[PDB]
Amino acid sequence: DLGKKLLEAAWQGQDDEVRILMANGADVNAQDKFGTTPLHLAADMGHLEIVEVLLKTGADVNAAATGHYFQPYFSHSVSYFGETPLHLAAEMGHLEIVEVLLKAGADVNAFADLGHTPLHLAAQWGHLEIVEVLLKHGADVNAQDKFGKTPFDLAIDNGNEDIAEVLQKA
Amino acid sequence: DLGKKLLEAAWQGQDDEVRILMANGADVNAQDKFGTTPLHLAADMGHLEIVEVLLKTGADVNAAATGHYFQPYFSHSVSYFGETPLHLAAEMGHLEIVEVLLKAGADVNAFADLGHTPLHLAAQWGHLEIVEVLLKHGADVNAQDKFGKTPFDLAIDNGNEDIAEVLQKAA
Fold it and tell me: Which of A164, A166, A67 is CA-nearest to residue A115?
């Protein structure tokens, strides 16, 4: 199955294999069991070149995985949470990928589980430079999650004072 | 707590935060609920320098866990338990990290989930250079996991003929 092989190759960062699989007709928008696409997998794992080739070959920049959580869920073990590739790039601190996704049209305020935006995720996981790029691209600083938490609140809660100060004056 | 922050910094490849947390007394051998250690996460996510500094400061190279790492999911998958950082580095194709783990005394053959080896994963996921390094360090080519699979089998099953040929010649 080419779609499964393409998901695996993007996840593994196997650039050549990605190109071959898609030339053999692998679906660029293939989904795993939970709606996760090759673009999600490459964005999360930091594979910039693969993100670029997937986008060039028609990958859906707005693809959302299926929803998962209804209560706070933040941990290192999160695999799917109603999220777009931009959520994953922001979560994992991949600046170059965040910029490429935004250039391709990603909603800077796409909502994942609990209503979390990419800015919530960047603030939660301490990625100051990504916070700044998101704000520059129109990220909603006042976005509240299901429980009323803004990215500022998450930054404060997880000890990211540098980010809290940036958000507070935005 | 500091151990949880250290796990997260390792996962994120945050070298400076790893430095700071450890200076403040973070346990290099902290575990999450599934047994996952900072060394598992740095090895899995490809953060070589963090792997190196964890090993230098006393991380257990053979820590076993049944963790939840970022991955795609498919129906009818099989699962294994008790993986070590070497399993994860071999699976994800991180050659430099495989080398550093082996030099630090990582077990190559003997695991909690019997016969499920880093060689199996490197063959399964098409990492030829890692297959060759593991063989050089005495990996058992004929090791069978709980499903009766050898690394040759997994190489064939996944279309990795180059690796399959290497394994068959080494048999």
Answer: A67
Resolution in A: 1.7
| CB of B17 closer than 8 Å to CB of B39 | no
User: How far apart, in Å, are the Cα atoms of A14 and each of A5, A29, A69, B73?
Assistant: 11, 17, 31, 18
d(CA B105, CA B87): 14
Closest residue of B to A124, CA-based? B8
Work out the burial of residue B58: count CB atoms within 10 Å of its CB; fewer than 13 is exposed, 13-18 middle, 19 or more buried. exposed
* Helix (H) / strand (E) containing B53: helix B48-56
Instruction: Check the CA dihedral B159-B162-B163-B164 and report its sign.
Output: positive
Residue with the two structure tokens 């080519």: B141
The answer to whether A13 contacts B126, with C-beta atoms less than 8 Å apart, is no
Spatial contact of B87 and B121, defined as CB atoms under 8 Å apart: yes
Match 């695999």 to its residue by tokens.
A79
**A34 interfaces chain B, CB cutoff of 8 Å:** yes
Query: Domains in chain B, start-ordered, CATH in brackets?
Result: 1-171 (1.25.40.20)
Instruction: Output the CA torsion sign for A33, B117, B122, B6.
Output: positive
| A chain contacts of residue B32, beta-carbon cutoff 8 Å | 75-77
Q: Please indicate whether, in this complex, the C-beta atoms of B11 and A44 are within 8 angstroms of each other.
A: no
Cα–Cα distance list, A31 to A8, A64, A69, B52, B68 (Å): 11, 10, 19, 36, 20
